[PDB]
Amino acid sequence: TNKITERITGHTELIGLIATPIRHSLSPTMHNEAFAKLGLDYVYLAFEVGDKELKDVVQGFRAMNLRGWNVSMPNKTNIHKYLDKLSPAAELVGAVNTVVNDDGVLTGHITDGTGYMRALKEAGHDIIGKKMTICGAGGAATAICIQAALDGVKEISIFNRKDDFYANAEKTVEKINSKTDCKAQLFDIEDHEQLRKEIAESVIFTNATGVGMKPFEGETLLPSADMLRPELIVSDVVYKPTKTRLLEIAEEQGCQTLNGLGMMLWQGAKAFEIWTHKEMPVDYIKEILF
C-alpha cells in the first residue's frame, strides 16, 4: 500500500533563511519540526545569499508574498535598506536577523539578544536591575548588550580586544548610555586588573566571542580561575562544545553555568512567535535537536 506522506502541498508556504555560508544551519530543522508538531503548513529553507544577491532576493520575497524569514551573515547589517520598518531593537542594534511581512509591509527584527535574555530567565537567572561584564563586540555581543540594556540591566562593562570590533563596541557604549538608562563602559580585554574588578562587581560573567569555539576550543579569555566565585553566574553563547573551557573552570569554581543552547532555542522561538503568533515548543525541539 502507498499513500500521500508529504505534508508539502500547493497550500504549504515558505519561511526563508538567507545568508552565506549557510547550508549547515540547524534552523531549518528547528522550524520544520516546530511546524510539523503544531500542524502549521509552513516549511523553512535556507538560501545562499550574499551582498550581491540580497536586494534581488528581498524584492523576490516581497513578490512571492513570503510571511518572513531569517537573515544571517553577511546580510544582517545591510538588509534594512530593503525593509519598510524596524523594531526598536533592530533600529538600535543596526542589525536585522528576522523579517516579517504584514500585508506587504516588511518589518525587521533582531532576535539573538531576545533569545539570550530569555534563556537566562528560563534558567532562573535574574540579571535585570543588576550588573553584567561581557566579552565581545560582534553581532551577538552587540545584540545582547542592547537587548540587555532595553530589558533593564543596570550596568554593563564590555571587554574586547583591540580588533575590528572595538569601534563597534564604542558605538554600543555610546548607544546604550545616550538612548537607554543602562550604564555601559568599554575596556580592553587585556586590561586584566580592570577585568578582575568588573567580574567581582557583576552578578554574571558572559562570553559572547568565538573564543571557546573552534578554532579556539580549550581556550578562554578568562586569565585566572580566582576571578570567579561560587555565587557568580557564568554564561557562554557557545554551545558546541557543550562545555567551553570557561564553563569548565566555572564549574570547578562552584559557579552556576549556562552554555548557548538556550539562546539558540529561544532566538528561534522568538522568530517563530513573530511569524505565527504561536509559542515554539522549546522543550520538545530541544529533545529533538540534542
Ligand X SMILES: NC(=O)c1ccc[n+]([C@@H]2O[C@H](COP(=O)([O-])OP(=O)(O)OC[C@H]3O[C@@H](n4cnc5c(N)ncnc54)[C@H](O)[C@@H]3O)[C@@H](O)[C@H]2O)c1
Q: Are 134 and 184 in contact (CB under 8 A)?
A: no
Q: Tell me how far, at minimum, the Cβ of 114 lies from a second copy, in Å.
A: 22
How far CA 273 is from CA of 7, 21, 22, 94, 137, in Å, comes to 21, 26, 22, 22, 27
Distance CA 48, CA 129 (A): 41
Block residue for cell numbers 540594556: 149
Range 103-132, binding ligand X (CB under 6 A): 112
Task: Choose the catalytic residue: 76, 131, 175, 270.
Answer: 76
List the end-to-end C-alpha distance of the chain, in Å, as a whole number. 34
Rule CB under 6 A: say whether 137 interacts with ligand X: yes
Q: Tell me how far, at minimum, the Cβ of 42 lies from ligand X, in Å.
A: 21
Rule CB under 6 A: say whether 72 interacts with ligand X: no
126 is in an annotated binding site: no
Using CB distances below 5 to 8 A depending on partner kind, what does residue 237 bind out of ligand X, a second copy, none? Answer: ligand X
Distance CA 234, CA 198 (A): 13
72 is in an annotated binding site: yes
239 is in an annotated binding site: yes
Rule CB under 6 A: say whether 260 interacts with ligand X: yes
φ, ψ (nearest 5 deg) of residue 105: -95, 120
Which amino acid type is present at position 92? L
Using CB distances below 5 to 8 A depending on partner kind, what does residue 267 bind out of a second copy, ligand X, none? Answer: ligand X
Distance CA 162, CA 274 (A): 36
Which amino acid type is present at position 189? I
Per-residue mark of binding to ligand X, 141-180 (x: CB under 6 A): x------------------xx-x-x---------------
* SS3 state at 196: helix
Using CB distances below 5 to 8 A depending on partner kind, what does residue 209 bind out of a second copy, ligand X, none? Answer: ligand X
Q: Which three cell numbers stand for residue 95?
A: 542589525
For residue 74, the Cα-to-chain-centroid distance in whole angstroms is 15
The alpha-carbon radius of gyration of the chain (Å, integer) is 20
Distance CA 116, CA 233 (A): 14
Sole window of 51-59, 76-84, 155-163, 196-204 interacting with a second copy (rule: CB under 8 A): 51-59
Q: Tell me how far, at minimum, the Cβ of 86 lies from a second copy, in Å.
A: 22
Q: Give the residue numbers annotated as catalytic, written as ranges.
A: 76
* Residues of this chain that bind a second copy (CB under 8 A): 2-6, 8-14, 17, 22-29, 32-33, 36, 43-49, 52-54, 56-57, 59-65, 284, 287-289
* Residues of this chain that bind ligand X (CB under 6 A): 112, 136-141, 160-161, 163, 165, 208-211, 213, 216, 221, 237-239, 260, 263-264, 267
